[PDB]
């Protein structure tokens, strides 16, 4: 599942 | 008719899913997991009704599969048609293992949609099925024993013993729980017998039962004598057993365990003065049966300075000389229950307590096995001699200890 | 203490696993399945605390990351939920808009960090600011 | 950047070698749990090609998504109808079975008349495909389906050529009457039944089953009407399928139910029905298991079928343990007072074995036998003591409980043997067999001397033992005391004194004291009272209500011939 | 400015190769051909150079860290131990600290290149080795370095960074052969790291004092005296002092937090200066509670909040001062008001927990609206169960209608697990609490009445018992019972409690006609044709007193028992019950039968069997 995403802001 | 058709592997995980009619849904399908596949105490039969559901299941390998229906539908035909679905399927790709299924998703749930339309089957019979089957199909597929012994008559002990540990949340949550498993045969029995040893199922395919803060996970072990040929047609290990006594198979389950007593612990704590304790013991195996040699373990405070009880059967002593009340049973049957309740006077004290209250331990005997394993039949077979299986003497005891069954105050 | 520290995202792939006493693999890995099958169906609704076998898990989800911390049932729990925290604050220092890939591609130095910020069971540096300068002094080293 | 947007591409490529090749991926990801639905369109217009592995696949992705989108289904309408015309059968069949699988209240008016279409199509795999989507769409608009014609037209299918659309055809119809009995869309007039008594020896294994479960609705309402239509289905008890040989019995003994016994036919077809479920025991353990579900109820309606059979229900040691259960209470059910010595020498063995848990059923079994046949009740007993003798405790439990109630049943008669039985007083650990010694030690007091410290040795853990037992001990001191008193006076002190001072049970307390008052302020009553010839104790049911049982040997074929509950109780 | 490097391009590759993979079998096949390729490069002539064996440990632990087992390898690694450059020493340690073995030969090579590191005098290196030891703490090791870690730890010139890591090492060796650790001289040096100018190096030391302390609490009394003095000095110094350990306006919240649950290892402090200086510390960390928040980030309330809620247990902890025990049970009331989730579950234990305090006042009573609210809304089942506790261990005379009230609706809404659990609290609470007798006897036939299956035999039995002895509720008893008996269900447990509080009394409710004596034995025989055989008995001998009490109902309910079904009944128990009763309703005399049947005595208060009093100076009896 799009394990790009930001982990923060 | 046939609203669900449903297969899942050995763990009850969904492989394959098809709904032929509304009424069916995420309902019966968890339904059947954890009804069937995950029964306990549940003696499993052919058809069985969950909810004004029915539902008609086959094993085959470690592979389970079932229909559901919301009607009342003619009940032999089910099982006429999925003995059908499997011939078909192991046409296309023999054994119909978890493995070959996860290879076929498309040949199968293709297959489905011609073997059977809204629930009505269709005439399978690898018929001119190839017409229609427009998808490929991935196949794939000792202990010794001094000749000539010789017995006065023929006996054959079986012990089953089993120490089933636990650790209990005080609203009655399982944290963690596993049964140690060992089927000792004593046989006393002459000639060159092949036996073969039928049990239901409760297990799928080591270490000394050793650890603490040490995770069980779940295995089998069998002796060198036994031919595992045929584990997945229920049991049928068949073996030639060495003279006298051996272990036949050790294990260790984790799953379905009939867990016997449930232990409710209403603690109270009233100022730091005194402290108002009372314990249930619920029983919950079977009422035909009795466990034996019940102790009960509450762990009392250090800055205790006084005790007392009030025991409904049974009785208990306070023993300083290890820090705890001693409740002990003579015997209770099944599905009662008993209670006992203390107060605990505590000398003052400025602090320093935290207690940490360890569990209530619980030590205890029982006629049946926690992992859910039964005996299903034991038949001796010997060709030289040909004595009757039937004048062959056969007893057999469960024995299931408590390991370390603490319940949390 | 903590026993464990678990980085799986919501399929359930670990990607980061410091463990902090001696378990089989056949433990491990039964180990992971289970804080899985329970953190992953808790619904926000619930609490950031879980019951798990003898000890307990703080954890907080992050994008399709699951850090999981597993700790004596007497621990400090919104102590514990914070640690978690500054430590995802710190790899998105070190990485810069950190992601489950440079967790996965990195995995090698998500250690060297984890390591820096916790050891032994207990807790080891608390300053975002020593250990970006530690981190960042390394890296600069053959 | 990728995944699903990659896959909308490797389909868009208007090289059908390569749409093809990567339609495959897709409808993999489907049956992983992947939550496709972004491609619905792309794979839709795939279809407009000619390669039949590359069609039948796009139809998986279709109709395993309009039982479950049925909304965002009905927008490949168009191209659905256009495959109804399709050349290829295939293509022809595949586009029905699909159409009718969404469930839309809006479908009704498209599918209309290209189903009327296939419905006389010239290739049965297309006929065979429209009868049983009629019944498709009846379920989303029964009127609609009464109204175009379509009820007739299933009617008419009835007669086809190839079975395996009159099979469909007689299902998909009487999935309709069902749902709408008054309605009379069946009706079986004394005409039309020759109509389908003739397909009935054809439309492949299943649609003989549909065939025959009509013929149980029907009712010929004239004696010789029922024999000659009997006699047409007589065959059919061979179709190896246990669902046709089931449901031809289910027939037979609905029709059988008329002629008292005259014409040997009667006495026939009696005959005649053993062998065939004989050999219904023979298939599959489920198969097993719902022969015997039935059999149970068959033996019962007439007993007369599977009289001498009794052999065939005896029990396999490998059987499944619910056929071994099933079979047992079959064996019960035949047990005959000139056969029980074959059966106890069954019985005897199944306690000997090695299946506890049917070994307990297996003795309480012998208890049944004394029961129900009445002039064995010596036999009986003899065995179980016999099976006592072995000590093994699981045995003697179950066995010490069938005399206890073998005892209240028939005369006292064996009052020789009890003071043997008070040799195993050792492990006598389940509540319900110390309930039943206790008091078999306390009416026969007179026979024991042992009573007083049989008796007492039980009292010495009163408030430890089972609110049974302890009910069962305070009754059984009593009775020794009129029986003996002053080799007892300290005993019925005692009890009445824990029953009544120590125990908490509010209904042994009171049964303390209604004993302790009786006896101290009117011995001659309580004499009077407390013994005194009580009856010979009655069974229970048996067998089930002569009502009940017929209007579920009407069902002999279905689920309701399994749970024994009538059709009402699941739905 | 220095450089930066670092970078392994093969393992990029074996890693998007892999994460690749068009099924979950090529990935399989991907790892045979790069463990194929990996062995066969160690396993030939020329040893790799470091950066080439640094990348194919890498490789393999990765594929480790896959599922895969590696039956190989361990000697590269063992190479890379010795190198001089830190990305080739961490490398191979971070193999052999992940997977490790028996091989009692490379166990004293890795303890080789270890002693080496440590000894090296390098702090990069022997950090490396403190951690190796620290990760995976094998017996072996303890046994080689339990000796040197402390001489490292106390020596004056070991640096900041090493001082933390050896103290963390040094604890996991107490834990591992507690017998190897000792108590030297170290002991008195390492308390003294509590003033150390570094605050990284105070929470390592006080991780290893806490441990310490609870085996051998009098070599760490004098831990008390700092912890207490520096937790003074954190919690006053604002933002800008404490630069670095400063966390969204929180300073050194984890060190506070290490701090007191430090000073929970011992008493209150024995000198009253320190007494007197903590004391005053908590009436300040309590001060800036209530204080308006100096962000709203959740991140500074929940770092606040997990120093405010550890003062609070070592509040409870000591017990001590009434003052700050109100205080920390007025904040832990405002969290439970406060809407959310974590607080409301933190609060809730930690208020039942203060509930045990005897010098609080019980000032825990004083929020039964704010709590009987939270179990009220909250779902989330764990709030839920940790405020019933909280009402069970507050409930006295006054607010336990209150109580037994809302817990009433918590139990027709719960999870199986919870019915019986929480059917005895409520049998205890009323039994206890209960001033209005009527009050008991209503709540304890609700449990019965709806959540039935839970009640066990002791709490019906008990009001059964209650009802014989009090008599300003056998009336009301009477007609309750024939009330909620009219129900077509009601669990068995009614019709047991029913019928023989019709037995005994109910021939004083007879007079109204809506419950005639006839009406009364017409309603329980109803009932009879399908209960257990010991409900069946209990309803005979409630027959028998009827034919007793009303002679014109004699009549009808002699042929109940007539009839075969009782007088052939197959039940043993039940056949008596019935010949008997039938017997002497013909037998007995007028006078003799109401003898027997008068109304059995009260029920006697069974009482404690004392299993210790302090008696030769000392607990046991």
């Known amino acids: 599942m799009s394990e790009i995403k930001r982990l923060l802001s | 008719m046939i609203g669900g058709l449903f297969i899942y592997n050995h763990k009850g995980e969904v492989l394959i899913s098809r709904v032929y009619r509304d009424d069916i849904g995420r309902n019966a399908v968890d339904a059947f997991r954890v009804n069937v596949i995950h029964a306990r105490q549940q003696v499993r039969s052919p058809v069985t009704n969950i909810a004004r559901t029915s539902f008609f299941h086959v094993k085959r390998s470690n592979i389970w599969l079932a229909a559901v229906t919301k009607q009342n539908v003619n009940a032999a035909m089910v099982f006429e048609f999925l003995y059908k679905m499997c011939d078909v399927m192991a046409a296309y790709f023999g054994k119909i293992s978890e493995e070959n299924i996860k290879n076929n998703f498309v040949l199968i749930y293709e297959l489905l949609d011609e073997i059977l339309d809204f629930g009505y089957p269709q005439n399978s019979e690898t018929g001119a099925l190839k017409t229609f089957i427009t998808q490929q199909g991935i196949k794939s597929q000792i202990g010794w024993r001094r000749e000539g012994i010789k017995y006065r008559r023929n006996e054959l002990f079986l012990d089953v013993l089993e120490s089933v540990n636990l650790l209990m949340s005080p609203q009655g949550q399982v944290l963690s729980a596993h049964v140690s498993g060992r089927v000792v045969m004593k046989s006393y029995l002459s000639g060159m017998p092949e036996c073969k040893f039928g049990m239901n199922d409760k297990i799928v395919i080591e270490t000394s039962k050793s650890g603490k803060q040490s995770i069980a996970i779940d295995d089998c072990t069998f002796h060198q004598c036994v031919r595992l040929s045929k584990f997945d047609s229920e049991r049928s290990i068949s073996?030639?057993?060495?003279?006298?006594?051996?272990?036949?198979?050790?294990?260790?389950?984790?799953?379905?365990?009939?867990?016997?007593?449930?232990?409710?612990?209403?603690?109270?704590?009233?100022?730091?003065?005194?402290?108002?304790?009372?314990?249930?013991?619920?029983?919950?195996?079977?009422?035909?049966?009795?466990?034996?040699?019940?102790?009960?373990?509450?762990?009392?405070?250090?800055?205790?300075?006084?005790?007392?009880?009030?025991?409904?059967?049974?009785?208990?002593?306070?023993?300083?000389?290890?820090?705890?009340?001693?409740?002990?049973?003579?015997?209770?049957?099944?599905?009662?229950?008993?209670?006992?309740?203390?107060?605990?006077?505590?000398?003052?004290?400025?602090?320093?307590?935290?207690?940490?209250?360890?569990?209530?331990?619980?030590?205890?005997?029982?006629?049946?096995?926690?992992?859910?394993?039964?005996?299903?039949?034991?038949?001796?077979?010997?060709?030289?001699?040909?004595?009757?299986?039937?004048?062959?003497?056969?007893?057999?005891?469960?024995?299931?200890?408590?390991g370390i069954y603490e319940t949390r105050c | 203490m903590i026993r464990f520290i678990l980085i799986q995202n919501r399929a359930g792939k670990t990607r980061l696993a410091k463990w902090y006493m001696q378990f089989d693999d056949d433990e491990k890995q039964k180990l992971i399945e289970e804080v899985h099958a329970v953190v992953t169906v808790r619904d926000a609704k619930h609490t950031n605390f879980v019951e798990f076998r003898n000890f307990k898990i703080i954890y907080r989800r992050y994008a399709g990351l699951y850090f999981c911390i597993c700790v004596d049932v007497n621990d400090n729990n919104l102590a514990y939920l914070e640690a978690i925290h500054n430590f995802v604050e710190v790899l998105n220092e070190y990485f810069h808009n950190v992601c489950e890939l440079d967790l996965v591609f990195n995995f090698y130095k998500v250690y060297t960090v984890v390591d820096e910020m916790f050891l032994a069971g207990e807790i080891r540096e608390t300053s975002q600011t020593k250990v970006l300068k530690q981190l960042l002094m390394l890296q600069s080293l053959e | 950047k990728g995944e699903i947007f990659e896959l909308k591409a490797e389909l868009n490529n208007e090289k059908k070698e390569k749409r093809k090749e990567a339609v495959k991926k897709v409808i993999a990801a489907m049956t992983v749990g992947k939550d496709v639905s972004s491609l619905f369109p792309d794979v839709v217009n795939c279809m407009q090609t000619d390669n039949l592995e590359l069609k039948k696949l796009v139809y998986l992705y279709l109709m395993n998504y309009?039982?479950?989108?049925?909304?965002?289904?009905?927008?490949?309408?168009?191209?659905?109808?256009?495959?109804?015309?399709?050349?290829?059968?295939?293509?022809?069949?595949?586009?029905?079975?699909?159409?009718?699988?969404?469930?839309?209240?809006?479908?009704?008016?498209?599918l209309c008349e290209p189903l009327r279409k296939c419905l006389k199509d010239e290739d049965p795999y297309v006929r065979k495909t429209a009868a049983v989507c009629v019944a498709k769409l009846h379920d989303i608009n029964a009127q609609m389906v009464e109204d175009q014609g379509f009820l007739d037209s299933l009617r008419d299918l009835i007669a086809d050529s190839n079975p395996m659309v009159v099979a469909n055809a007689v299902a998909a119809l009487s999935e309709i009457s069902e749902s709408h009995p008054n309605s009379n869309l069946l009706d079986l007039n004394p005409?039309?039944?020759?109509?389908?008594?003739?397909?009935?020896?054809?439309?492949?294994?299943?649609?003989?089953?549909?065939?025959?479960?009509?013929?149980?609705?029907?009712?010929?309402?004239?004696?010789?009407?029922?024999?000659?239509?009997?006699?047409?289905?007589?065959?059919?008890?061979?179709?190896?399928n246990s669902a046709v040989v089931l449901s031809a019995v289910k027939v037979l003994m609905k029709f059988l139910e008329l002629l008292p016994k005259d014409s040997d036919y009667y006495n026939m077809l009696l005959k005649?029905?053993?062998?065939?479920?004989?050999?219904?025991?023979?298939?599959?353990?489920?198969?097993?298991?719902?022969?015997?579900?039935?059999?149970?109820?068959?033996?019962?309606?007439?007993?007369?079928?599977?009289?001498?059979?009794?052999?065939?229900?005896?029990?396999?040691?490998?059987?499944?343990?619910?056929?071994?259960?099933?079979?047992?209470?079959?064996?019960?059910?035949?047990?005959?007072?000139?056969?029980?010595?074959?059966?106890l020498a069954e019985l005897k063995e199944y306690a000997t074995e090695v299946d506890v848990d049917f070994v307990r059923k297996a003795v309480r079994a012998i208890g049944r036998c004394a029961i129900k046949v009445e002039q064995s009740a010596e036999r009986c007993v003899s065995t179980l003591l016999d099976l006592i003798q072995t000590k093994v405790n699981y045995v003697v439990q179950?066995?010490?409980?069938?005399?206890?109630?073998?005892?209240?049943?028939?005369?006292?008669?064996?009052?020789?043997?009890?003071?043997?039985?008070?040799?195993?007083?050792?492990?006598?650990?389940?509540?319900?067999?110390?309930?039943?010694?206790?008091?078999?030690?306390?009416?026969?007091?007179?026979?024991?001397?042992?009573?007083?410290?049989?008796?007492?040795?039980?009292?010495?853990?009163?408030?430890?033992?089972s609110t049974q037992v302890q009910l069962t001990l305070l009754t059984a001191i009593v009775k020794l005391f009129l029986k003996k008193p002053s080799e007892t006076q300290e005993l019925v002190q005692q009890v009445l004194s824990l029953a009544t001072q120590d125990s908490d049970n509010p209904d042994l307390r009171d049964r303390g004291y209604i004993y302790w008052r009786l006896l101290s302020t009117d011995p001659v009553t309580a004499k009077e009272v407390v013994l005194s010839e009580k009856p010979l104790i009655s069974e229970e049911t048996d067998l089930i209500e002569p009502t009940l049982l017929d209007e579920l040997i009407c069902h002999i074929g279905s689920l309701a011939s399994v749970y024994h509950k009538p059709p009402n109780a699941f739905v | 400015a220095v450089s930066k490097g670092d970078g392994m391009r093969g393992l990029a590759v074996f890693i998007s190769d892999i994460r690749n993979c068009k099924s979950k079998e090529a990935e399989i096949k991907r790892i045979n051909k790069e463990l194929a390729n990996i062995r066969s490069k160690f396993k030939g002539d020329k040893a790799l150079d470091g950066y080439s064996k640094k990348k194919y440990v890498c490789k393999l632990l990765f594929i480790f860290l896959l599922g895969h087992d590696i039956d190989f390898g361990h000697m590269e690694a063992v190479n890379l131990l010795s190198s001089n450059r830190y990305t080739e020493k961490q490398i191979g340690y971070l193999f052999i600290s992940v997977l490790v073995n028996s091989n009692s030969e490379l166990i004293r090579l890795i303890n080789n290149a270890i002693k080496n590191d440590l000894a090296s005098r390098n702090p990069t290196f022997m950090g490396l080795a403190l951690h190796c030891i620290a990760n995976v703490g094998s017996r072996e090791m303890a046994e080689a370095f339990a000796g040197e870690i402390p001489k490292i730890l106390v020596a004056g010139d070991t640096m900041d960074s090493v001082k933390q890591s050896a103290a963390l090492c040094l604890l996991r060796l107490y834990r591992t052969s507690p017998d190897l650790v000792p108590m030297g001289d170290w002991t008195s040096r390492v308390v003294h790291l509590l003033n150390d100018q570094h605050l990284g190096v105070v929470?390592?030391?006080?991780?290893?004092?806490?441990?310490?302390?609870?085996?051998?609490?009098?070599?760490?009394?004098?831990?008390?005296?700092?912890?207490?003095?520096?937790?003074?000095?954190?919690?006053?110094?604002?933002?800008?002092?404490?630069?670095?350990?400063?966390?969204?306006?929180?300073?050194?919240?984890?060190?506070?937090?290490?701090?007191?649950?430090?000073?929970?290892?011992?008493?209150?402090?024995?000198?009253?200066?320190?007494?007197?200086?903590?004391?005053?510390?908590?009436?300040?960390?309590?001060?800036?509670?209530?204080?308006?928040?100096?962000?709203?980030?959740?991140?500074?309330?929940?770092?606040?909040?997990?120093?405010?809620?550890?003062?609070?247990?070592?509040?409870?902890?000591?017990?001590?001062?009434?003052?700050?025990?109100?205080?920390?049970?007025?904040?832990?009331?405002?969290?439970?008001?406060?809407?959310?989730?974590?607080?409301?579950?933190?609060?809730?234990?930690?208020?039942?927990?203060?509930?045990?305090?005897?010098?609080?006042?019980?000032?825990?009573?004083?929020?039964?609206?704010?709590?009987?609210?939270?179990?009220?809304?909250?779902?989330?089942?764990?709030?839920?169960?940790?405020?019933?506790?909280?009402?069970?261990?507050?409930?006295?005379?006054?607010?336990?209608?209150?109580?037994?009230?809302?817990?009433?609706?918590?139990?027709?809404?719960?999870?199986?697990?919870?019915?019986?659990?929480?059917?005895?609290?409520?049998?205890?609470?009323?039994?206890?609490?209960?001033?209005?007798?009527?009050?008991?006897?209503?709540?304890?036939?609700?449990?019965?009445?709806?959540?039935?299956?839970?009640?066990?035999?002791?709490?019906?039995?008990?009001?059964?018992?209650?009802?014989?002895?009090?008599?300003?509720?056998?009336?009301?008893?009477?007609?309750?019972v024939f009330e909620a008996l009219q129900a077509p269900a009601c669990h068995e447990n009614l019709v047991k409690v029913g019928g023989y509080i019709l037995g005994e009394f109910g021939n004083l409710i007879a007079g109204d006609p809506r419950s005639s004596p006839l009406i009364q034995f017409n309603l329980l025989h109803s009932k009879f044709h399908l209960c257990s055989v010991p409900t069946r008995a209990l309803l005979l001998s409630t027959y028998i007193k009827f034919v007793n009490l009303f002679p014109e109902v004699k009549a009808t309910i002699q042929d109940v028992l007539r009839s075969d079904s009782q007088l052939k009944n197959a039940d043993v128990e039940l056949q008596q019950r019935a010949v008997e009763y039938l017997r002497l309703s013909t037998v007995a005399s007028t006078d003799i039968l109401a003898t027997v049947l008068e109304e059995m005595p009260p029920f006697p208060e069974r009482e404690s069997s004392i299993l210790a009093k302090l008696k030769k100076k000392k607990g046991g009896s």
Request: proline share 5%.
């Open chain 2, 239 to 402: 073996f030639i057993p060495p003279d006298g006594e051996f272990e036949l198979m050790r294990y260790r389950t984790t799953k379905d365990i009939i867990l016997p007593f449930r232990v409710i612990p209403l603690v109270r704590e009233v100022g730091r003065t005194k402290l108002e304790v009372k314990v249930v013991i619920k029983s919950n195996f079977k009422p035909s049966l009795l466990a034996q040699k019940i102790e009960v373990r509450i762990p009392t405070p250090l800055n205790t300075s006084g005790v007392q009880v009030i025991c409904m059967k049974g009785k208990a002593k306070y023993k300083a000389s290890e820090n705890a009340i001693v409740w002990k049973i003579k015997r209770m049957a099944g599905m009662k229950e008993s209670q006992i309740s203390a107060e605990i006077e505590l000398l003052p004290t400025n602090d320093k307590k935290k207690w940490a209250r360890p569990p209530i331990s619980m030590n205890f005997e029982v006629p049946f096995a926690p992992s859910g394993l039964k005996v299903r039949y034991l038949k001796v077979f010997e060709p030289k001699l040909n004595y009757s299986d039937h004048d062959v003497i056969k007893w057999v005891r469960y024995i299931g200890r408590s």
């Open chain 4, 66 to 110: 309009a039982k479950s989108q049925p909304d965002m289904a009905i927008m490949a309408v168009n191209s659905f109808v256009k495959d109804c015309e399709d050349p290829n059968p295939l293509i022809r069949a595949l586009a029905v079975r699909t159409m009718g699988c969404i469930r839309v209240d809006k479908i009704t008016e498209y």
């Open chain 4, 191 to 240: 005409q039309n039944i020759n109509k389908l008594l003739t397909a009935l020896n054809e439309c492949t294994e299943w649609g003989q089953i549909f065939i025959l479960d009509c013929l149980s609705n029907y009712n010929p309402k004239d004696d010789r009407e029922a024999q000659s239509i009997c006699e047409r289905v007589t065959p059919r008890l061979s179709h190896a």
């Open chain 4, 272 to 343: 005649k029905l053993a062998p065939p479920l004989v050999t219904l025991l023979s298939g599959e353990p489920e198969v097993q298991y719902v022969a015997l579900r039935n059999i149970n109820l068959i033996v019962q309606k007439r007993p007369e079928i599977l009289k001498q059979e009794i052999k065939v229900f005896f029990v396999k040691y490998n059987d499944p343990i619910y056929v071994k259960l099933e079979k047992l209470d079959i064996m019960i059910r035949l047990a005959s007072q000139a056969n029980i010595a074959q059966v």
């Open chain 4, 398 to 465: 179950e066995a010490i409980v069938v005399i206890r109630d073998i005892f209240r049943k028939y005369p006292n008669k064996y009052e020789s043997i009890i003071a043997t039985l008070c040799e195993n007083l050792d492990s006598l650990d389940e509540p319900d067999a110390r309930a039943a010694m206790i008091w078999i030690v306390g009416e026969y007091a007179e026979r024991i001397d042992n009573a007083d410290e049989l008796l007492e040795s039980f009292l010495e853990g009163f408030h430890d033992e």
């Open chain 5, 203 to 480: 929470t390592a030391a006080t991780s290893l004092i806490t441990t310490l302390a609870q085996k051998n609490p009098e070599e760490f009394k004098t831990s008390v005296s700092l912890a207490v003095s520096r937790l003074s000095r954190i919690v006053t110094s604002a933002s800008t002092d404490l630069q670095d350990y400063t966390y969204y306006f929180v300073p050194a919240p984890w060190l506070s937090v290490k701090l007191l649950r430090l000073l929970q290892c011992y008493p209150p402090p024995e000198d009253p200066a320190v007494r007197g200086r903590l004391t005053e510390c908590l009436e300040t960390i309590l001060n800036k509670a209530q204080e308006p928040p100096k962000s709203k980030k959740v991140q500074h309330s929940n770092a606040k909040n997990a120093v405010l809620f550890e003062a609070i247990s070592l509040i409870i902890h000591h017990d001590s001062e009434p003052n700050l025990l109100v205080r920390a049970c007025n904040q832990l009331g405002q969290f439970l008001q406060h809407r959310e989730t974590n607080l409301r579950y933190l609060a809730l234990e930690s208020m039942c927990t203060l509930a045990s305090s005897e010098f609080s006042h019980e000032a825990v009573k004083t929020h039964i609206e704010t709590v009987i609210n939270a179990l009220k809304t909250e779902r989330d089942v764990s709030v839920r169960q940790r405020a019933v506790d909280l009402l069970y261990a507050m409930c006295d005379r006054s607010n336990a209608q209150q109580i037994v009230a809302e817990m009433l609706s918590y139990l027709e809404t719960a999870d199986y697990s919870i019915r019986e659990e929480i059917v005895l609290k409520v049998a205890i609470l009323a039994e206890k609490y209960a001033v209005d007798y009527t009050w008991y006897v209503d709540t304890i036939l609700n449990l019965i009445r709806i959540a039935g299956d839970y009640v066990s035999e002791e709490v019906w039995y008990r009001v059964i018992q209650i009802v014989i002895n009090r008599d300003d509720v056998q009336g009301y008893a009477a007609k309750t």
